[PDB]
Amino acid sequence: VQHVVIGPSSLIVHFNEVIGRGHFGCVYHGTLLDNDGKKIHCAVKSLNEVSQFLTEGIIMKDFSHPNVLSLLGICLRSPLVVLPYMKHGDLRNFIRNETHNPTVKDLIGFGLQVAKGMKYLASKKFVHRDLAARNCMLDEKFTVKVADFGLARDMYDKEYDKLPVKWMALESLQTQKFTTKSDVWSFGVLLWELMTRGAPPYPDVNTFDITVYLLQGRRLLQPEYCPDPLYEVMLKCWHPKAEMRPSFSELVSRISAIFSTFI
Ligand SMILES: CN1CCC(COc2cnc(-c3cccc(Cn4nc(-c5cccc(C#N)c5)ccc4=O)c3)nc2)CC1
């Protein structure tokens, strides 16, 4: 924690500007100062046991990838988690917004960015457990950051019942076993959210019903603007046998090929 401590004098937290709400606390717009006096935009996560949470999440300072959320630091005083501000907020609200019009290629490009971030996390043997479009952020350059892990972990939406059962693999619903292969299943649902522009998966299925539903021989339907090879990728992500699901390295390779076919 020593190398990532932020002095309370160097942090301005705007408690009036709430930009996110979670069960553990709120996200606020903040301001950090650099050695030269330049203001850096923050997202300050509040935390309301605490030592255990910081112990579990301090591994995030060692992660560094352009598609993975980084940690700016921790302000000790209840501790505050300092994260980089993500101008366009969460990926799900972005694709449901009406100020921007992402093309089918842009949506596939967002999925490819997530797959690159996940490929990095899987190479570090890190299992996300809650991969979903609501849990990825978009910065000022429209770069996707896989977020909601370590110190940033929280439930930021009401899509839990708490577990995100509609994004969970069949073996995780049955035995509560989470692996990189169950993150590949969640990644499939995330591609489907991207291709439907943020539609809720299985809308007429109650969260308690999902296991029986999947076991009947059912999967999410192909969205109307989803290319066939991308729907095949989603179907491979949802393979009933975890070991038969593509790796994130294979997903990056395959999705980059599909992305390249669009003008
Ligand atoms: C209209 N609105 C005004 C504010 C604008 C900027 O808002 C921002 C909101 N949040 C951050 C931020 C950055 C780094 C880390 C986190 C923590 N974190 N939060 C979420 C999160 C936040 C809000 C809603 C939902 C959901 N569902 C999910 C997911 C994963 C995660 O790790 C938050 N930055 C900017 C966007 C447009």
Numbering used by the authors: 1066 to 1113, 1120 to 1148, 1152 to 1235, 1244 to 1345
Q: Can you list sentences taken from the study reporting this PDB entry?
A:
The oncogenic MET mutation Y1235D, which is described for different cancer types such as hereditary papillary renal carcinoma and advanced head and neck squamous cell carcinoma, leads to constitutive kinase activation presumably by destabilizing the autoinhibited KD conformation. Recombinant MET Y1235D protein was obtained from insect cells expression in the nonphosphorylated form as confirmed by MS analysis. The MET Y1235D mutant revealed nearly identical SPR results and thermal stability shifts for tepotinib as observed for the WT 2P form and Y1234E/Y1235E mutant. The biochemical potency for tepotinib against the Y1235D mutant was identical to the WT protein and in good agreement with the SPR KD value. Again, some parts of the A-loop were disordered (residues 1236–1243), but electron density for Y1230 indicated identical π–stacking interactions to tepotinib as in the WT structure. Surprisingly, we observed a frame shift in the A-loop of the Y1235D structure involving Y1234, which adopts the position of Y1235 in the WT structure. Consequently, D1235 in the Y1235D structure is shifted toward the position of S1236 in the WT structure, which is solvent exposed. Again, the partly incomplete A-loop electron density indicates higher protein flexibility in this region of the Y1235D structure in line with the observed lower residence time and melting temperature (Tm) shift for tepotinib. Our biophysical and structural data are corroborated with FCCS target engagement studies indicating reduced kinetic stability of the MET Y1235D•tepotinib complex, whereas the WT receptor complex was persistent over more than 72 h.
The receptor tyrosine kinase MET is activated by hepatocyte growth factor binding, followed by phosphorylation of the intracellular kinase domain (KD) mainly within the activation loop (A-loop) on Y1234 and Y1235. Dysregulation of MET can lead to both tumor growth and metastatic progression of cancer cells. Tepotinib is a highly selective, potent type Ib MET inhibitor and approved for treatment of non–small cell lung cancer harboring METex14 skipping alterations. Tepotinib binds to the ATP site of unphosphorylated MET with critical π-stacking contacts to Y1230 of the A-loop, resulting in a high residence time.
